Amino acid sequence: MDGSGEQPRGGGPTSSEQIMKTGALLLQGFIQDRAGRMGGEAPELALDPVPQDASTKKLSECLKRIGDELDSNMELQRMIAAVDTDSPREVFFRVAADMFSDGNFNWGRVVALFYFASKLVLKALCTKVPELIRTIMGWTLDFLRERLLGWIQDQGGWDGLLSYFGTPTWQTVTIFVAGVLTASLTIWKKMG
């Protein structure tokens, strides 16, 4: 009975509350923007926040600027087309686990995760199964709340995410996630 600390989680910045919240807004943001304009009533994401915040708005510009460049890769588009759905639950956890199956903390994993799921989400939007749209965002925050929560606290907060970019050469961040994301697809084939 002698806790050296006291209340590292009672009230103040760097709280699992600001992280979880920005996390569910950021992803929900790059999607609504990629789905189109907007639609009153929104019977789909009804009880849900909406893009609104000069801070979360800029971090969207980073995921947006690359969501367009990467999504125009005809080679990476030939790759995702080489996979398939069938069991998006096993693949989502198997492919994911592979991104963190070594090392511990990087930058491709995160970016490569939001965009990888963006398709599972958008792809479900076309398929006409909105009850799956919500079931997906569910598997996303599940992995974020369970694994990417303690690590987001040590970096202070999502400020480290955006502080990482700000780099002039934008071809090294697009080739990072692509080189890493494609690797998982390269082996996911069968085994070899």
In this structure, what CATH number is given to the domain that contains residue 127?
1.10.437.10
Q: Which domain holds residue 61?
A: 1-192
In the chain, which residues are last before a break of more than 2.5 Å from C to the next N?
none
Q: Where are the alpha helices (DSSP H) in the chain?
A: 16-35, 54-70, 74-80, 88-99, 108-126, 130-146, 150-154, 159-164, 171-188
For 136, other C-beta atoms within 10 Å of its C-beta total 21
Q: DSSP class of residue 73?
A: -
For 192, other C-beta atoms within 10 Å of its C-beta total 5
In 3D, which of 58, 35, 64 has the Cα closest to residue 48? 35
Say which experimental method was used: NMR
CA angle (170 as vertex; 164, 171 as ends), nearest 5: 120
Residues 6+ apart with CB under 8 A from 54: none
Give 131: exposed, middle or buried? Use CB within 10 Å, 0-12, 13-18, 19+: exposed
d(CA 118, CA 113): 8
| Domain total in the chain | 1
Task: Identify the sign of the CA torsion 136, 68, 45, 14.
Answer: positive
The two tokens of residue 140 are 């996303």
